[PDB]
A paper describes a structure:
l-asparaginase II (EC 3.5.1.1) is an amidohydrolase that primarily catalyzes the hydrolysis of l-Asn to l-Asp and ammonia, but that can also act on other substrates, including l-Gln. Many studies focus on the EcA2 from the K12 strain (EcA2-K12), which differs by four amino acids from reference biopharmaceuticals, including Elspar (EcA2-4M). To understand the structural implications of the four-amino acid differences between EcA2-K12 and EcA2-4M, we solved their crystal structure in the presence of l-Asp under the same crystallization condition and data collection method.
The most prevalent amino acid sequence observed in EcA2 biopharmaceuticals, including pegylated forms such as Pegaspargase and Calaspargase, as well as the reference product Elspar, differs from that of the K12 strain by four amino acid substitutionsV27A, N64D, S252T, and T263Nand is referred to here as EcA2-4M. The EcA2 from BL21­(DE3), hereby cited as EcA2-4M, is the prevalent form used in commercial pharmaceutical preparations of l-asparaginase, including Elspar (the innovator product, approved by the FDA in 1978), Spectrila, and their PEGylated versions, respectively Oncaspar and Asparlas. All monomers in the asymmetric unit showed the l-Asp in the active site. The specific activity of EcA2-K12 and EcA2-4 M was assessed by monitoring the hydrolysis of the l-Asn in vitro. These results demonstrate that the EcA2-4 M variant exhibits approximately twice the specific activity of EcA2-K12, with values of 69 ± 4 and 25 ± 2 IU/mg, respectively. However, the results show that the EcA2-4 M variant exhibits a substrate turnover rate (k cat) approximately twice that of EcA2-K12, which can explain the differences in specific activity and cytotoxicity. The analysis of the binding curves obtained from this experiment allowed for the calculation of the dissociation constant (K D) of the enzymes for l-Asp. This analysis demonstrated that the EcA2-K12 variant has a dissociation constant for the product of the catalyzed reaction that is three times higher than that of the EcA2-4M variant, with K D values of 211 ± 52 and 66 ± 14 μM, respectively. In contrast, the EcA2-4M variant shows lower specificity for l-Asn, with a k cat Asn/k cat Gln ratio of 18.2 ± 0.2.
Author numbering:
A (entry chain B), B (entry chain B), C (entry chain A), D (entry chain A): 1 to 326
Amino acid sequence: LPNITILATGGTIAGGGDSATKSNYTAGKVGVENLVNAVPQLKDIANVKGEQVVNIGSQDMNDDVWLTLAKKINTDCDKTDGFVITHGTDTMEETAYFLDLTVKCDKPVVMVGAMRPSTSMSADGPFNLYNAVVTAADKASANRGVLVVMNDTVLDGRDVTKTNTTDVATFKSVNYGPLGYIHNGKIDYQRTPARKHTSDTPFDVSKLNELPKVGIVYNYANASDLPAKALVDAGYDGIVSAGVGNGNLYKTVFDTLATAAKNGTAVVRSSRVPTGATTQDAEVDDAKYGFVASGTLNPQKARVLLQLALTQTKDPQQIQQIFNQY
Amino acid sequence: LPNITILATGGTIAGGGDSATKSNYTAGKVGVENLVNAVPQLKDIANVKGEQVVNIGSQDMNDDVWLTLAKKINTDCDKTDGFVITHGTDTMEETAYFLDLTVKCDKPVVMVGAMRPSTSMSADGPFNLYNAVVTAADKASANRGVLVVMNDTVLDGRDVTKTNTTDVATFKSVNYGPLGYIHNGKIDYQRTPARKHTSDTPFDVSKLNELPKVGIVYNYANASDLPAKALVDAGYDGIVSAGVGNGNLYKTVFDTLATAAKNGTAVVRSSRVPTGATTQDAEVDDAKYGFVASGTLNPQKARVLLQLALTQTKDPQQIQQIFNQY
Amino acid sequence: LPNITILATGGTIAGGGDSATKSNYTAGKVGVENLVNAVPQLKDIANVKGEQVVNIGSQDMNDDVWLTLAKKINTDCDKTDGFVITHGTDTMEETAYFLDLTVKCDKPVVMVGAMRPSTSMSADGPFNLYNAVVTAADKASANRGVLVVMNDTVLDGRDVTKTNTTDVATFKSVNYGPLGYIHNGKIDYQRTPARKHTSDTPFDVSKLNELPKVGIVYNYANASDLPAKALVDAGYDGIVSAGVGNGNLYKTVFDTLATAAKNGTAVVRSSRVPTGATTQDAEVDDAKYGFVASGTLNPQKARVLLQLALTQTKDPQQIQQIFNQY
Amino acid sequence: LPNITILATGGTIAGGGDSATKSNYTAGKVGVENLVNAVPQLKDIANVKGEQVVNIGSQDMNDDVWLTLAKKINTDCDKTDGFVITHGTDTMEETAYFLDLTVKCDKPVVMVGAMRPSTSMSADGPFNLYNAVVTAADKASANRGVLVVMNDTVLDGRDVTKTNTTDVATFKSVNYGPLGYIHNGKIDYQRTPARKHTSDTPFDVSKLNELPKVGIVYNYANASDLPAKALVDAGYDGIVSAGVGNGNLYKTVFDTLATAAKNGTAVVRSSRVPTGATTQDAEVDDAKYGFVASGTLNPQKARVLLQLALTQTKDPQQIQQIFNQY
Ligand SMILES: N[C@@H](CC(=O)O)C(=O)O
Ligand SMILES: N[C@@H](CC(=O)O)C(=O)O
Ligand SMILES: N[C@@H](CC(=O)O)C(=O)O
Ligand SMILES: N[C@@H](CC(=O)O)C(=O)O
């Protein structure tokens, strides 16, 4: 049977809450061995090893956990046939993309979480973790980058995003769609990501103890320049704009960032809008102000790639090329 | 024929850009008479009156325009059989909700914009404005609150949100769905909003020259408390959290706002997640910290209702009741 | 606590496999009392009683079970505070709509099923049933017609359809959306159906032992007229076209359905297309030929209405009327 | 500039009404040269030439046009840099897939249609055709099989289907998603189909004047076995079940299709359900009875594959093989 490492970093997948019929619970309170023995059917398909990395709620997720994650995956590559990370759903789309860029293992890394806590009636997490292990054990799952397996679906880490607050089917690759579906412990893969991933990137976090500070401002009607101004005062290496429509800013947030761009801050335009590209050659001359268009990458996902781009260069056009490649 | 007032505040619906096959253009550069005479078929269904309110891009939209808007609609109620506001698509979901709460006209107010500029090949705006006028002229459209009519669909202002950056079909009511569809200049309405709207609210902007400052922070991995802290320094009456999953915050953004709640700032939890409620009785004890759960209202939409709630009260539980009613 | 009767018909909610990990199962081999006792949390929210009506896979559902279900609900109406129907998912949309039109009872009738068998890991049916009892218990569910509760979502019988073959979230209201969502045993209803339903209809099945024969024919490239033909020859009372696009016919089906319609068969043009209305005033002169446009009714839903419409009149214009009203 | 041939078949792209405001029209009454000349921006991006193949409404599309189209494309393959097929929207999914399997040509074949007639206000077809010439001109479109370009979106012939009766955005890839999006004449391709296509298939239509007869039968509550029966009796070569749920049959259709399948008719179980696979290993012993599971192929797509599969073998296991591969 395939040697699958489970890496455990928390999430509702490992959270409980008194009544099976109450929505009240705590993230990251259950250990990796409980999870594993809660799904005895893993024994039949994998030689699972549990390792607890942290035990937090992914709302609390951070760079440290990311760096600890890439490292341990990269370091433990050749002692196992695939990895599975149990993770909170709230920021799984970020970690998954982070790992997607920083992991150099060709072998299946798969993230998985659960929208209902383990004490819930009809809890999602057992079958989630089952199918995630299945995915991790499929030969075909190799060389497709970091995966999220949720609700019977294999999603790529680049596009996977959380579309609903509570639905078990919340995870969806909302622009290019999923890679394959899971029936009966078998996957028919029909799609594979075309953007460069895992081993095909230059990113290398091996020797890194922290990441270039990057923050996110939201644009709305009458948007305040105060969030933006704050981040530059504090010397942020990067601001990602959560812009309106095709990545537009408010007048004040525009000027602040237009300045910031001329004074060394990288600025990437993305969109609060849930699907679709932030394009160049629309209403904002990106070359003129030195901005970068985030493409299909929503804000938080743009934040991930900004940080890792920043650890190569500070130049608007080198970054844009990285948004067009990765 | 029905006396329909068009109110013009800008948008791509009134923007152009050299080549019909280039995506480069300027918002708010075309006047209301050009728009009207660009769609001669309005003459057959309405007695249209054009009035230019401003001529901006809705990325630049603000409170002044909102207040000018409600007022003129409320004031001109009884000189016309319905209104239509031409608006940029970027923040139409906000204005539409604003108007939804502040307008006291039972008569059809309908917003409309276009995702392709008027010089574009196969431009959306003609037919958009046609069908919006149709909507404004339908008796059935009365008493359903402020409407967005886009891509052959009548959407309520509360739920209407912009789901795509570029698609002409971007506007969708992503939790409770549309109210009716438009075929052949006729609408079959099947749905009407159940939340209190227009005349059934207490909001009254008649005598108001400004609105309680409210801002939006975004939560992500390793979120900075700097945006939040900034807004409280400056004495904001309200912060809306763009939280992860079911409205969760990062540890730092949590504490800052937990403080802010104890020191007079209203704090409303919403979600960056595009569909679904921010619920109470989930992972965050709202009563304990004095927070308010934004419900199906995304951040920007929560911002609208926070501002207008703030002009009644500063108390967490009176506000929550307004999020549950409106 | 309310009194809630469960009319169990079968399906996968009541199906079984030899495995929680394999997908191979048999529908409706489990009694009603088993379903009730595997969800003892029902006790906190209602006084439940389960009666077995049939125990079939809903792929085999037929006119007799519907006549049984309906009158049984109308008859036993004031012995209970609410009804929950366990039912297979395959034809549930069809039953829901049928009870939607035939149920003269003024109490919540809620349909529920499962996509995973009860033996299956993370089986959806314990919590489905719970949520369906909640919906059927909530006083606010009255006056919304026959209802379907799947994946934390309350759906109207008219729009509800199965959008996916395997996914737990298959059931959606693809045109007008859901009536309400369910969190922590509570429903935030924001919507009600506008087409008249339940007691508002003239359809009285209480003396019928038998429904007009209505069959359905698929259109597609190079369509055979053999099925149309074979239904006319058995003197079916009505035929529904699952047409292409907006109710369009393949030329030999058009000939057969047109002749048949002059000779007294009713024929409805519906569409194989999964969302959107089959409208009038496109490419087919419905009035010329005696055809009825289905509207948003898909073929099998439109068969439900058409059957019930044939019990009132055999007149094309009058069936249009019903098709515009119910 | 590339050389792009346009094989025009008709549809609404080439349809006309008496009005830009009314919805009443006739499909395919406009010549190819008209289409080309109403979009003179084609000049900047290609050397276009339009040949008229037929001028039908695609609701009337049939096996002969497909045989014509296919060989004409294979024959005229190296006279051009690319092909664009104008075509009605109703059966376009069916043609696309057919050319997907039959086109041995190694150049972009792109299908395009319109949902609004050319006379209509904000008609979608000028820009559709433009975008289809872009797609057919882009060198990056090679090696992705026969393609469909609608609403700024490049879709693979296999997954693409018409999800809505009237909306300009009807065409989606409902299972695996789009191949690429189109902005400002440019395509960000992030995906390619994995099922083998075009030259990768053993289907050679180049000497066929005639395709195996394959019909389609709908399942629904109380289904008539009359259509199945009537197709067996005309010695159809194959039958597709538009089943309920995951390929399920109504009992009398099951009997008829099972007997027919032992007697040499091939029968595929597809599904009326608009998304998701008709899988094996659920409720039907496909192997026992000689049935083939369609997978993600919907009935009409599955008829395309089944027809072409009948030209290779009459053997159930071997048609499964094709159904797992193409
Ligand atoms: N707050 C949780 C949500 C979940 O896991 O369901 C998290 O850690 O993301
Ligand atoms: N930036 C534009 C976008 C549009 O109208 O299409 C606006 O004013 O919202
Ligand atoms: N064949 C089953 C499917 C299910 O219930 O999940 C039925 O319709 O009974
Ligand atoms: N009946 C038309 C529909 C369209 O093209 O929009 C066709 O399929 O030809």
